[PDB]
């Protein structure tokens, strides 16, 4: 799926994404990203033979900061993409009444089915 108003620069997030609410701090996805950064720092201390859980706390803090920052911007991009998908979908629902009719909600007083008993 492509443009969708192909003026469209490279544009990592438009100004229209500042209308939807931004992702909160300590949302569980960025907490999972922080845990993944801490596991990255632990295993980085494990690749070289420096001791684990020590001697790299500035690298631990750098990894956590870098992953949480990048994941924050990617989550804002995710929210923008889902918002524009729903906006385009409901615009197409409103723009064409013919193909999407009201279905007759026949209640179960008059809807017949087969039965097929398991004896």
């Amino acid at each position: 799926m492509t443009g969708r108003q192909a003026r469209a620069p490279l544009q990592f997030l438009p100004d229209e994404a500042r209308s939807l609410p931004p992702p909160k701090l300590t949302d569980p996805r960025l907490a999972y990203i922080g845990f993944l950064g801490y596991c990255s720092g632990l295993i980085d201390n494990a690749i070289r033979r420096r001791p684990v859980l020590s001697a790299g706390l500035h690298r631990q803090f750098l990894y956590i900061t870098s992953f949480v920052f990048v994941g924050y911007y990617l989550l804002k991009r995710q929210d923008y993409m889902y918002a524009v998908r729903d906006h385009d979908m409901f615009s197409y629902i409103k723009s064409h009444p013919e193909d999407f009719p009201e279905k007759d909600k026949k209640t179960y007083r008059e809807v017949f089915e087969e039965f097929h008993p398991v004896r």
Partner: protein, 319 residues
Amino acid sequence: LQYGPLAYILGEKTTKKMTENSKLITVDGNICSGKSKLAKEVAEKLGLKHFPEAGIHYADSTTGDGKPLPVRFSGNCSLEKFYDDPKSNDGNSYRLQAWLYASRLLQYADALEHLLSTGQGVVLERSIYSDFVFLEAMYRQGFIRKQCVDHYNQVKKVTVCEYLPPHVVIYVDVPVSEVQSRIQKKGNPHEMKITSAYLQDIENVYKGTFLPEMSEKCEVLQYSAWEAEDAEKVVEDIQYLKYDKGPWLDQDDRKLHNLRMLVQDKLEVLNYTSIPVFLPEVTIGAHQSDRVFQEFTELPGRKYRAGYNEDVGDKWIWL
């Protein structure tokens, strides 16, 4: 990481630490004859450093602490058992030989790095070419099956063919009876139990195969037996010569940069030691390797990158 490619770009070159003091001189003599005398004399006179003889525990002595590790970790060589009984069924000639090959290769890499880094020039003793002479002679006497000699030939074809040869080789020629008189004036009983035909085959391989395969590359100085304790003659022969053979006449910078990158990070040197061809004398089982590596990590200095190691220091691992 002290040297890198960015050092080669920002820092100027690798040429201007040359020449006419910085050189590879290599004393090669027969066993219990080519010894610390002439090597330490040219190290005193010429103004040039002296690496020691490549012992068994040179890897123990080149990094960390200077105490030699016990034989469960630096072996299992047992040179005393080789000079006592060189016909065992456990296999103690070739394990000793491949350990000496690793030792000679490590100390030759150290000397090549110290030559390419600032000089000032290095002497070596009983180098890698004398090591394949040792193997060929030990197969002449019939201690090793021929398949394992083929294995060593494969290791020698893989490893040596990326380096540069030494500049000059100071050879010492000593006959058999003088070596036997020296080794029976010395007094080490394990060396008293040596035989003489093995010494004879060392001399015959070390003359007939070695010197034509030098082929005036690694220009030779074949001195006599009593031509020791003679500083002026060897220093005057070294100063009064000029070089034609060998690849050392032009590199110019790029090959020396490749060598300085290769010799640092010494696991690059040691990537080609264990090939393997599964060598039924040599290959350690799984369980022995497990308990030996675990008890090796039980040592206080050896475990987990001794620049960071606790219980010795360093009080800066950030709280």
